[PDB]
Amino acid sequence: GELAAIKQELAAIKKELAAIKWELAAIKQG
Amino acid sequence: GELAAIKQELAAIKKELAAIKWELAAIKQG
Amino acid sequence: GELAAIKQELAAIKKELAAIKWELAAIKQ
Amino acid sequence: GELAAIKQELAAIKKELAAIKWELAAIK
């Protein structure tokens, strides 16, 4: 319920973190 | 105490991250 | 558990976000 | 054991943020 929504936010946070890592890798590269 | 509070905190953290991500994408373009 | 422990992690996360905010301002600076 | 699991997920997110913060500071 609320627990399932928490898991959805946790997963969405991980997606943003990965996005950030990929932006940083591009920045370092160029 | 409540799972809804944690959920809300996580949603706010996810938005923060999204903003960081966008800011970094902008840096990547310079 | 626990609730108290979850609160501390959240607080720690928020502070790292603030440090990141700091670094981003400096890069723009 | 959901609370403990959430706590652990948060700790890992915390550590990733610190690593991102260190990388950021290294930019240029």
Asked if A5 and B2 count as a contact pair (C-beta separation under 8 A), the reply is no
CA B7/CA A7 separation, integer angstroms: 9
- Identity of residue D12: A
Query: What is the signed CA dihedral for B23, C11, C8, A19, rounded to 10 degrees?
Result: -10
* Resolution in units of Å: 2.1
Residue of C nearest to B19 (CA): C21
- Identity of residue A4: A
Name the residue among A3, A13, A24 with its Cβ closest to that of D13.
Answer: A13
